[PDB]
Ligand binder design. Structure first.
Ligand SMILES: [Zn+2]
Length: 108
């Protein structure tokens, strides 16, 4: 398709990072080249061609839905924003646009 894409490898990395971070909220910037998210810009959440597609963060609760706070984060920068949630299984994730609307990510 012609929508944003994400590598299965990055999803695995993200979900494992979330599991490792639990119960804290893991957060990082989604990056890569062309039209595929396949790299991460790690951020201190614990107490050529490269581009920043947006952000990804985890929820320690079983909800992958965004809060009002998340919407304010999504609007600051980046086109895409992923939220992963407990139990962090293969399908425990959802992607949203800069406005908080759920959008697709083709897994490649
Ligand atoms: Zn959130």
């Amino acid at each position: 398709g012609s929508s944003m894409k994400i590598s299965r490898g990055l999803l695995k990395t993200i979900l494992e990072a979330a599991k490792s971070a639990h119960p804290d909220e893991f957060i990082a910037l989604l990056s890569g080249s062309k039209d595929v998210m396949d790299e991460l810009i790690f951020l201190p959440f614990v107490s050529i061609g490269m581009k920043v597609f947006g952000t990804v963060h985890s929820h320690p609760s079983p909800s992958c839905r965004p809060s009002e706070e998340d919407l304010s984060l999504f609007t600051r920068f980046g086109k895409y924003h992923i939220i992963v949630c407990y139990p962090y299984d293969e399908n425990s994730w959802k992607c949203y646009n800069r406005k908080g609307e759920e959008v697709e990510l083709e897994v490649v």
